[PDB]
Every structure is written in structure tokens, then in C-alpha cells.
Amino acid sequence: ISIMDRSEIVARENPVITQRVTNLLQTNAPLLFMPIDIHEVRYGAYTLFMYGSLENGYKAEVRIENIPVFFDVQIEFNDTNQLFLKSLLTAENIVYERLETLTQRPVMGYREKEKEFAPYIRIFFKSLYERRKAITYLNNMGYNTAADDTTCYYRMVSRELKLPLTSWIQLQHYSYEPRGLVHRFSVTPEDLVSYQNDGPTDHSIVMAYDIETYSPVKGTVPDPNQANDVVFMICMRIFWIHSTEPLASTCITMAPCKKSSEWTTILCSSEKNLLLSFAEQFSRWAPDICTGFNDSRYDWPFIVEKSMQHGILEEIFNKMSLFWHQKLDTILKCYYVKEKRVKISAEKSIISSFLHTPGCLPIDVRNMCMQLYPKAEKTSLKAFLENCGLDSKVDLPYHLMWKYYETRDSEKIADVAYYCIIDAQRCQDLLVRHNVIPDRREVGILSYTSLYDCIYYAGGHKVCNMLIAYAIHDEYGRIACSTIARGKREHGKYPGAFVIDPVKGLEQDKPTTGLDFASLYPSLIMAYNFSPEKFVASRDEANSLMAKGESLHYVSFHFNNRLVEGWFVWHNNVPDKMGLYPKVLIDLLNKRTALKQELKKLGEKKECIHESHPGFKELQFRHAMVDAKQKALKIFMNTFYGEAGNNLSPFFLLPLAGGVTSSGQYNLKLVYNFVINKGYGIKYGDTDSLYITCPDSLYTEVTDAYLNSQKTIKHYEQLCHEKVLLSMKAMSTLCAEVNEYLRQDNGTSYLRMAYEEVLFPVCFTGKKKYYGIAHVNTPNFNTKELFIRGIDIIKQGQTKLTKTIGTRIMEESMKLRRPEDHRPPLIEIVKTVLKDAVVNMKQWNFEDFIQTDAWRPDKDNKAVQIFMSRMHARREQLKKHGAAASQFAEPEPGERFSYVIVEKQVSSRKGDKMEYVSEAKAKNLPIDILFYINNYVLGLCARFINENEEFQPPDNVSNKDEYAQRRAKSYLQKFVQSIHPK
């Protein structure tokens, strides 16, 4: 029977590599391995288990022993205090191993060179449990402790050992013990060497699976709790972590399924039998990653509840792992994660519930799509698929699947198998093309954290871990750092940033572009030496330090009705004096710069070679991994300030974050004043961008060269072209002057101003609301793509009508028009374009008005509910004379039929004017366009009107923006229903 294990599959796919790997095995030579799943023994002698794949593809369990278990506390080295520490450690009978003395540099507070180092007693332990108990007790007593990772100790093990848990690892020496499909290695941290090179192509196995459930009640989501509600069907595929080609496929079902060559059909009689078959197939495949779409919310809970009902969960889990036998209660308590708090955005988070089998890190691809698209309001797999440019098969609606399973049709069961396997393939495709595993691996490499942390955790702890990892190195002086929040929990708001009132309106004369700071907050940290160990709090200490000739930067900001003061010792551009935070940012910036240059070289080489080259695959892999590495560097670059400003962070320093914000505001003030004193106007400025204008005196010569000429359309377009050219050149010179002035002010070049395009035709409609033609290097006013930064266009827009009208007003408002010619404002032009759209219907077609819905007894919106009642009554009254259920049956499995609001003879509810597309094409009734205008595209032009001065509400209104919105919309809707009688 062709149920092939790891060994056979990897030997068939990689025969030569398998032979080489074997030859390494019996020779005990160093070989290439990397981890995927990390599991720790939290009781007894601590042991770290890495489950991963060898370079050929063997499933490998690497077990590290003799890992030192320790943490540090700021205590003097005297033996009396050591004995006292042991005394109150043994008071609560907490056992330790030994004591060590080493001098480290505290991370909090500035210290002089002769007092730079501080004593640290080190306490060793045998178990993570004892170490955590001791850490908690010491923090209760108030001792300043460092290197005290309490939850995930493997991050520390990855930290001082310089051993990434998501990169290739070379095993110099090991106690090899083959056991079935698991090649067990017993190793010691001494002979673990991270593979610093690029490394060979990965051969880790990811398994994507999807389930189909049964429930005798029609029209309801099956309940795992209900006995009658069951799983009738499950499918699964295995792939390489990078390839979308399935290595093997297995289908396990209830009804007799037609045999297929594309997958192995396993026939089971009972749900217990199906679950056991799934467990056996998973165990013999032993994948490194078990993944599925929304599995942590629907599939895994359903499977676990079914196993509990059958009382087979312990056996299922033991077959999942086979690495350590665990009792059922232990499984439920530890390995079955329930309602895991997955952080999606700053404010949005979702729950997850999965059975974390050792040796297979679970992935919820829906969670990955959430993370990569935080603001995507459409969350279905179909929604993400075409959002990412992938197509799905005809997803059979639930009801016909239901009748298919009930009738036990073998062909229809095979069709369900095809659909479910296509679902798993789409899941794998989304996981692969989004490059989720490799760039998560890169993030783990940078942060010295496991892939599990890279998946089910935010980036704050990753930034923390990277900070300690950098800090604990020798040249820096072995900085001692703590990973626990300390001090009183202070909550409040920083002083408001320097907000420049945007010059609302549409610009046709002065080219405008934003002088944007290059990584404002990281540059400020670099320039001002904003590091916790460079911070001075005492005013007298700051004065004494200044008396020694040292440069200090003073920060002052009002936080919770009180002034916060602090001083940071400048690094004097001396790498020895460079702070910890500036050192980390400098290293990251240099790495990113080198990687970007190498990526440019690699991409130009790739474009210099044809696609069918034999080395094209390897070159593409190299390019992909370089891009993932630089993207991880970028995301760590951006989130550094946010973690620094995170009050819950162990490294959080309120003076530090306040000083960073105040320095940003002060530098914005300085640049704004500098450019104002130079005659350059300002259109809009916020935080890090200054959209400025050149003085009118600069354009006078070309302006009169246009004026004294005949003033043709060609003359005006030229005038604009040389205006853009002069703006670019002169404002590049201005940017150079600004950079020089900033360097003179700060004494360093880290804080740098930059610009990347210019927007001669530009209109500002509010805060973070602007658009215009982008001229990057050469003035091109015929460009169709338009630089837009914040507007309700990129927020989907759905209907072709909405995107069409938005882009039409966009293009018409940005037309180059001579000052002598008519120059309507934004209000007039939007009124004109809307009049054109509504009066001239012949420009719109049926497909322009397509709107997608679903039969929603769950979401049961009032419009959706009246659509329910509408359609039901309509088919019931159509039944008397005929043709009422042919294409008109119940949409109960969320049938969409792309509903269109048709013209019905005159409540104004949406469901009142439903139309069937078949009926709409058959009779060709007109569409209720006025509904679409005055209820769906008013929200579009909303952002273009509320900026108008008379639409600003009086100061007595607390909800200013909402009232301005509502009354501007009322104005425009009265306009469109009064100028357009019919």
C-alpha cells in the first residue's frame, strides 16, 4: 500500500542528497539540520527539544542537554551577601546548583567608565520550575535581577549561545540514535554551531489539511458538542516548505469515495475510525508544520471535541507526537491551546485554539493573512485568495454538499474530496507565495526566537530579545539586561505633537512635495544617543557631567500634568561612547543597506538572465531569502520605537520615550522655521513629513516667459514641466542645506532629510489626506497612476461604479489648466462630475452596478432581513403561476447571485429593490442608480467636501467631524436630487 513515510518520500524526491546525508550519518560527520518546532521540559532536568528536517528531508529530533540554567541579580560579590542570598533562597526550599561571580554593565542609568561595570551573582538551576520560582521570589523581595526570561527560556538559550532557532544548524558531534522515522540526536551546547552561510535548499515538510463536517439539521453550522453533528470527511496534502507541488495526498471519508490517482482514499466506518486513520496518516507523514485556514477556530476545536466525545484524544495525541507519552489531563492543560490571544493589529486581535502536537508547529493561514493584511475587512479564504491574486474552484455551496452526503453518492463524495483537496492546495499556495515561513524565519534569526514566537506573538518581545542579544556581547561590555516590567505602572498621554494645519484645497501653481525624515525615530535615537544606559536623571549629576566637558542633551516634556526631565550623554560620534540603542540601530541600518545593495545586484543579475536558465531556481531562491531578510530588518527597524514607547516593555523608560517624541517635535520645529525663514511655504506637515512649496520668486522668469509668449496649451504644459524641474533641483539643494543645518545642530549626520518625488498637481483634503501626480525623476503629466496617501479609494471600493467615479474625479481635478482658463475648485468639479455621472446614464453598464451579498440568517442585518422576506414572499407568490424555484431556490448556503438594485415602481430599504441577474438580463429593467449615488458613493466623495470652510461645524459641536460629514452629505444629496429631476 502506497502510504509512504518520511524516509521513502524524501528518498524518492532527493535520492542523491539522501545518500550523502546517510553517508554523513554512519560516518558521524558534521551535518546540516535546522529546527522548526521547539519544546521544553519545564520539570526535572531542563532539556530543549528541536524538531526539524535534515538537509535531505529526514524528520529529526535534536535534543540538547547540559544547557546552563541561570539568571543574574545585581548584588555585590562579598561572601556574606552570597550566603545571605542562599539563605533566603533556601528559606522557601528552592534548590539551586551553584553560584558564579561576573561583572556586567547595568542597562538602566548612566555610569562613568571607572564605575561602568557592576557586580552580578549568578544562580544556577536544574529545572525551569525552580528558576522561575526563585525569580518570582527575588522580584517579590525587590532585588534587581537580569537575564530573567520566565516564560520562554529557549529564547535565552538562543540568545547567549548565538544560536538562531529558525536557521540552519551544523551538528559537529552528536549521539545518533535512529528510531523509526525520528532520527534522535543527543547533543551538548558546545558542539552546536549555527550555519552562518547561506545554507542549502530546505527540505522541511508542511502538511495542509481541511475538514468537512456533517450535521443532520439543515442550514446550521455543525456543532462539535452535538452528538449527531460529526465529521464525515477530511483531506490532507504534504509539500516542501517552499514548493507547492504535493509530495503525497491522503483522503479519509465516511461514504464510499471513488478511487482517484491524485490522492489516497482511506475509507472509514466510524468517526472514531476516521480520527484514528487521520492520526495514523499524520504520524507516518510526521510533518513539520500542520496548517489550515481558520483551523484554530473551527477545525482543531471540532476535532478535539470529537476525540473527547469518543474518548480517544490521548491516543490521537500520542500518535501525533510519539516523542513523549503524555496523560490526557496533561494534553488538555498544556498541548491543547484554547482561545490563544493572537495579536493582529494595534487594536484588533483574534482568538485561536489548536492542539499543539510536539514535532509539528501548527499554523493558521487565516491568522497569517490577518497579520499580513491587518486592515482587510474581507476575511474569508476566497476573499484573501483573489486579494493575493489566486483563483479558487467553484466552491460547492453547503446545501448541495449536504444532499450529496445524505444520498451517499460516491461520485459526489469524490467531488467533495476534490473540493477539499483544492482547499488545502489553496491554503498552501497562500502560505507559500506570501513567503510566510522564510520571512518569519528571518525574523526569528534577527530576534533569536523560535518560529512559534514568530507566529503566535507580537514583535515587542522580539525587539526585546534582539536588544538583550546585542547587549550581552563582549565588546559592548556584557550589558546586563532584565526582561520583566519594573517600577510603578504609569499610564498617560505624551504632549501633543507639533501639528501644522494643512492648507486645505487644490494646488495648481506651486509644485509641492514632502521632505520626509529618513526613519525619524531611529534617526533620533542614533543622533541623540537615546539609550537607557546613557540616561541621566539627577540634575546635579548632569551638571557635574557637563563640568567634565561631556556633551549632554536635555529633554523636558509634560506627562500627566507634571514636567519630566532627563539628560542623555551624547556619544560624540565615538563608537566607544555609542549607546546600546544607537549601536543596535547602526548595526541594523548597515545590515539593511548592505542587503539592499546586494539585492539590487542580485535582481539586476536575475533580469540579465533568462527564466529557463538551469541556475534560475537557485538564483530566485537567493533573491527571495535576501528579500525576506531585508524585510525582517525593515520591520524591526520600524517597530523599534513602538516597543521603546511601549510602557509594558522591560526596557521602557518614560523619560526616553518622552525625549524621543519631544526631539522629533523640536526637529520638526527647527526644519519648519528654517524653511520658513528661507521663503519656502508649507502646505502640510505632520510628525515626519513637510510638504513644502518653493518661493514664487523662483518661478518668475519662466512664468513671464510663458506670459510674454502666446500662452498656448503647449506653452502651459512646458511652463509646468520647467516648473517641476526647477522645483526638483532647487529643493534638492534645499534638502542638502537642511541636512547640513541638522548636522550642525546635532553634531552628527544620522538625522537626515530626504525627498523622493514631487507633486506639482496636488490637493489636500484633510489630515493625512492628499493626492497628486508623482514626478520621481522627470516631469510627466500624462501619467495615469496617481500618488495617493490616505483616501477611501484604496479601501477596496467594490463596485466598478465607485472606483470609476473616484478615478474620474481624481483625473479631472488634476488636469493641467492655465490660470487664464477656468480653474474650478474641488467642490465645483465634484459637482460637475456627479452631474455627468447621474444625468448621463448611458456611460454606465449593468456590470458596473454588481454588488455581492449572501443569505445571512446569522448576520441578519435589517437590510439583509428585509431582503430575506422580500425574496421569500416573491418566490412564494411566483409559485402560483410557475417558474419560482428553478434558479430561484433558497440561497441558504450563502448564495450571492451578485444582487443588483433594479428600478422598481415607487420604505427605501435595500432589500426592497433586489433583482435577479437572470431576471435583470431577461427583462433589462433599469438599475436604481440614484440608490447607489445617494447611499454608497456619497461616502466616497465625503472626504473631498468636509475640508471646505463653510462645511466646518461651529465650535459648539463636540462631534465636529461627524456633523460636518452629515451636513456636507446632505448638501450634496440635495444637490443631486434637485438638479436632476426625472
- H/E/C letters for each residue in 8-47? HHHHHHCHHHHHHHHHHHHHCCCEEEEEEEEEECCCCCCC
CA distance 238 to 961: 53
Which residues, listed in sequence order, are joined to residue 248 by a DSSP beta bridge? 238
Pick the closest to residue 422 from 290, 285, 236 (CA basis). Answer: 236
- The pair phi, psi for residue 685, each rounded to 5°, is -145, 130
CA distance 501 to 513: 16
**What is the C-alpha end-to-end distance of the chain, expressed in Å?**
74
Residue 88's H or E segment, with its range, is: helix 79-90
If phi > 0 it is left, if psi is from -120 to 50 it is alpha, else beta; for residue 17 that is alpha
CA distance 982 to 977: 9
CA distance 494 to 506: 33
- The pair phi, psi for residue 157, each rounded to 5°, is -55, -40
Contact in structure between 947 and 504 (CB atoms under 8 Å): yes
Question: What resolution does the deposited structure have, in angstroms?
Answer: 2.9
The SS3 of residue 802 is: helix
Contact in structure between 675 and 689 (CB atoms under 8 Å): no
CA distance 732 to 744: 18
Residue written as cell 539568571? 71
Pick the closest to residue 234 from 261, 207, 198, 216 (CA basis). Answer: 207
CA distance 909 to 61: 62
Rg (CA), the chain: 33
Contact in structure between 104 and 478 (CB atoms under 8 Å): yes
Contact in structure between 183 and 176 (CB atoms under 8 Å): yes
- The pair phi, psi for residue 503, each rounded to 5°, is -80, 90
For strand 182-187 and strand 59-64, is the pairing parallel, antiparallel, or unpaired? Answer: parallel
Contact in structure between 111 and 138 (CB atoms under 8 Å): no
Residue written as cell 518614560? 654
CA distance 80 to 72: 18
CA distance 131 to 147: 11
Neighbouring C-alpha atoms within 13 Å toward the C-beta of 591: 17
C-alpha distance from residue 563 to each of 532, 558, 659 (Å): 19, 4, 12
The SS3 of residue 243 is: coil
- The pair phi, psi for residue 717, each rounded to 5°, is -65, -35
C-alpha cell at 700: 518668475
CA distance 336 to 334: 6
The SS3 of residue 461 is: helix
CA distance 111 to 118: 10
In angstroms, how far is CA 343 from the centroid of its own chain?
A: 10
| Contacts of the segment 190-194: beta carbons below 8 A, 24+ positions apart | 192/64, 192/161, 192/163, 193/169, 194/162, 194/163, 194/164, 194/167, 194/168, 194/169, 194/170
Contact in structure between 631 and 435 (CB atoms under 8 Å): no
Contact in structure between 342 and 367 (CB atoms under 8 Å): yes
Experimentally, how was this structure solved? cryo-EM
Contact in structure between 790 and 768 (CB atoms under 8 Å): yes
DSSP-assigned letter for residue 299: I
Residue written as cell 536588544? 467
If phi > 0 it is left, if psi is from -120 to 50 it is alpha, else beta; for residue 621 that is alpha
- The pair phi, psi for residue 898, each rounded to 5°, is 40, 65
Spell 884-922 as b/e; 16+ CB within 10 A means b.
eeeebeebbbbeebebbbbeeeeeeebbbbbbbbeebee
CB atoms near residue 923 (< 10 Å): 10
CA distance 434 to 416: 27
Angle, helices 460-471 vs 616-645, to 10°: value is 90
Residue 351's H or E segment, with its range, is: strand 349-355
CA distance 443 to 628: 9
The SS3 of residue 267 is: strand
Pick the closest to residue 900 from 890, 884, 913 (CA basis). Answer: 913
C-alpha distance from residue 568 to each of 101, 345, 371, 532, 743 (Å): 30, 33, 36, 9, 18
Angle, helices 313-321 vs 300-310, to 10°: value is 120
CA distance 38 to 165: 8
Pick the closest to residue 640 from 697, 684, 586 (CA basis). Answer: 586
For strand 248-253 and strand 512-517, is the pairing parallel, antiparallel, or unpaired? Answer: unpaired
Which residues, listed in sequence order, are joined to residue 453 by a DSSP beta bridge? none
For strand 48-54 and strand 31-40, is the pairing parallel, antiparallel, or unpaired? Answer: antiparallel
Q: Name every residue whose Cβ is closer than 8 Å to that of residue 237 and which is 6 or more positions away in sequence.
A: 207, 208, 209, 246, 248, 249, 263, 421, 424, 425, 428
CA distance 695 to 311: 80
Spell 544-566 as b/e; 16+ CB within 10 A means b.
ebeeeebebbebebebeeeebbb
Contact in structure between 434 and 388 (CB atoms under 8 Å): yes
* Sequence letter at residue 167: S
CA distance 567 to 406: 75
C-alpha distance from residue 929 to each of 243, 806, 925 (Å): 47, 16, 12
Helices vs. strands in the chain: H and E counts, helices first = 30, 32
